[PDB]
From a paper:
However, we obtained a crystal structure of des4.3.1 with zebrafish ([name]) [name] at 1.7 Å resolution. This peptide inhibits human [name] with an IC50 value of 17.1 nM, 88-fold more potently than HDAC2. The binding orientation of the peptide is similar to the design model, but the structure of the peptide is very different. In particular, d-Arg8 occupies the negative phi region of the Ramachandran map (φ = 166° in the design and -46° in the crystal structure). If the d-Arg is replaced by l-Arg during conformational sampling, the lowest energy structures are very close to the crystal structure. The newly adopted conformation is complementary in shape to the contour of the active site and stabilized by several backbone-backbone hydrogen bonds and n → π* interactions. The peptide also forms both direct and water-mediated hydrogen bonding interactions with residues in the outer active site cleft of [name]. Notably Ser531 of [name] donates a hydrogen bond to the carboxylate group of Asp7 and accepts a hydrogen bond from the backbone amide of SHA; Ser531 similarly accepts a hydrogen bond from the backbone amide of bound acetyl-lysine HDAC substrates. Mutation of Asp7 to Ala did not result in a significant change in IC50 for [name] or HDAC2, while mutation of D-Arg8 → D-Ser raised the IC50 10-fold, suggesting an essential role for this residue, possibly due to its complementarity to the negative electrostatic surface potential of [name] in this region. [name] was not the target in the computational design calculations, and it is unclear whether the binding mode of the peptide to HDAC2 would be similar or different from that observed in the [name] structure.
To address this challenge, we develop a computational “anchor extension” methodology for targeting protein interfaces by extending a peptide chain around a non-canonical amino acid residue anchor. To test our approach using a well characterized model system, we design cyclic peptides that inhibit histone deacetylases 2 and 6 (HDAC2 and [name]) with enhanced potency compared to the original anchor (IC50 values of 9.1 and 4.4 nM for the best binders compared to 5.4 and 0.6 µM for the anchor, respectively). SHA can coordinate to the zinc ion in the active site of HDACs. In all the crystal structures we obtained, the thiol functional group of SHA coordinates the catalytic Zn2+ ion with a Zn2+– S separation of 2.3 Å in a distorted tetrahedral geometry reminiscent of that observed for the inhibitor Largazole.
Author numbering:
A (entry chain A): 443 to 768, 773 to 798
B (entry chain I): 1 to 8
Write the structure that this text describes.
Amino acid sequence: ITGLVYDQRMMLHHNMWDSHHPELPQRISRIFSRHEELRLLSRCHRIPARLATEEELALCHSSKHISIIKSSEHMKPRDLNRLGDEYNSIFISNESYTCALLAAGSCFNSAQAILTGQVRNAVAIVRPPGHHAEKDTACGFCFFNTAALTARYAQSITRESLRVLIVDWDVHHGNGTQHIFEEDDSVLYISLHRYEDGAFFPNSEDANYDKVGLGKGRGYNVNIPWNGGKMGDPEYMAAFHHLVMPIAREFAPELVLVSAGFDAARGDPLGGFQVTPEGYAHLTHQLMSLAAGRVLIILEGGYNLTSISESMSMCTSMLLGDSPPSTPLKTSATVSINNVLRAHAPFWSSLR
Amino acid sequence: XXDXXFXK
Ligand SMILES: [K+]
Ligand SMILES: [K+]
Ligand SMILES: [Zn+2]
């Protein structure tokens, strides 16, 4: 059985000064509608949304950060503008905190449904996104790091050191996820992202291939950065073939979380890449060979409404067991993949 | 508009 969580209340988070800001309420309703149209919704077990608790947010975030975002629930517009402007790329409304709680709690219920055996896998149609949120700050349209929190929540109901793989295929580097787990060998973070030597958001060398983790976490952070090319299905398939899947098999995770942004999709106004819905289906199908199929797909970014609706629907089709649907790499993608292989061969025998 | 992620 495949689980699905979606709650229209997450649409209430909005940009009161710029109604055309790309992190649109209708991102999630358009994805949900397309699941209905393609007759995928009726094939899924509907998992209820819920609010994360503040205790659960403290799995990854400081009490100061939690209390600041919480206080925005009661702010007047001038103070919402001032607070949001203190962060890198954040807008806040009075509903933002609640929606961020619903996004996280929905993913907790999905992870719980998988780990109690109610469903084999699941998809979470949630906003605002999470992967740029840091322990102490909001960032990049994200308030709390939903995927990072879900990994810790999964560990909290099974084994403190349960091996969790987070694959972040949003076109942006998940700086927050990397940092939260950078010293941790129980959570393997693998990010593919446009990088452009730091010109692409989040504009930090933290996203480069030589950032491999720290302390006992050394080797458990895998950055696959793209430079100088409009990447697409061939490049993402090659990165999965040479890097993501061999490393993941060696790690042997018990749960796979996908930070599934769809802004590397053909048509995305921010990403500039051309991964197709069929491409995302093949990526999902490969991940389903891990963790006895225990895969939770969490919406992150993705800003072309048609693109994200078709792409995420294709992912759910794969989770449901449908057959996957039916080219040389850009030369700089070969360079990137080889750079990551050189960086990580000391840690993963499958790369030697 | 000086928003890092939108490049606007
Ligand atoms: K990413
Ligand atoms: K890690
Ligand atoms: Zn993104």
